[PDB]
Structure 1
Amino acid sequence: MNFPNSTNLPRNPSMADYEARIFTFGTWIYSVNKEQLARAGFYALGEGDKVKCFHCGGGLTDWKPSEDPWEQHAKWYPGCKYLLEQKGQEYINNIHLTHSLEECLVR
């Protein structure tokens, strides 16, 4: 799978700019919004809806309409420094508590 980057230095600096990430998508048919994705640090791999974060290297796929780019970034890549910079730890905790409390009402 490859370990997530938790340093303050991006794993993919060529994708550090919003505009660079935006080009990777092209025509995007998926339920998830490409500008929203690029904003959350993601660029497209060109394989279905597979994206990676420029900073942590974290990969995500199979975007349901109910799944938010930032929330998913926090769910699966909580050590991402870009995520911490943009959203703050207070936002990150809420998302974590929300997901971890979803583990309650399902089970």
Structure 2
Amino acid sequence: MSDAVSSDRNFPNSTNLPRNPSMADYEARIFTFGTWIYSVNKEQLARAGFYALGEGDKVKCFHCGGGLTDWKPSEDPWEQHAKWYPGCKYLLEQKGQEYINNIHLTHSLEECLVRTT
């Protein structure tokens, strides 16, 4: 019956909160990177769960700790950390395998067209 805080004991740490996009998404992320920003939107990087390291470009994902720097002119937060490592737990929580497949099969992210003309 070995469970432990992992799945038994109450608040392990004591009170601290293990981050969360909904709260620390747009504003938060945008604060980590700064002014700079590629074709995509920082808010997007926040959606996937990418927290910069106090400097623009280089950012590590939560749980999957994927360190990505020097993104591509045509890409997206999810597409990057996902494809690179299709096993980001934090991702499964964001939009589950549903989105995971969205990328590893077709083009994910990038909207504004609704129906893509």
Normalised TM-score (structure 1)? 0.63
User: Is the 1:11–1:55 contact (alpha carbons within 8 Å) kept by the matching residues of 2?
Assistant: no
Normalised TM-score (structure 2)? 0.58
Secondary structure class of the residue paired with 1:101: coil
Match of 1:106 among 103, 109, 114: 114
Match of 1:81 among 78, 89, 110: 89
| RMSD over equivalenced CA pairs, Å | 8.6
User: Is the 1:16–1:55 contact (alpha carbons within 8 Å) kept by the matching residues of 2?
Assistant: no
**Aligned mates of 2:63, 2:19 — CA distance in 1:** 5
| Structure 1 residue 54 corresponds to structure 2 residue 68 | no
Structure whose CA Rg is larger: 2
Other-structure match for 1:90: 98
**Aligned mates of 1:3, 1:78 — CA distance in 2:** 29
**Number of matched pairs:** 106
Structure-2 change in CA distance of 1:3 and 1:63 (3 Å) = farther
- Over the matched positions of the two proteins, sequence identity in percent amounts to 100
Q: Which has the higher helix share?
A: 1
User: Is the 1:45–1:51 contact (alpha carbons within 8 Å) kept by the matching residues of 2?
Assistant: yes
Distance apart, 1:90 and its partner CA: 2.6
Structure-2 change in CA distance of 1:73 and 1:97 (3 Å) = same
Q: Deviations over 1:45-77 (max 9, x none)?
A: 245511111222111122223101111121012
**Aligned mates of 1:47, 1:76 — CA distance in 2:** 21
Note the residue ranges of structure 2 that are not aligned, 5 or more in a row: 1-9
Distance apart, 1:81 and its partner CA: 1.1
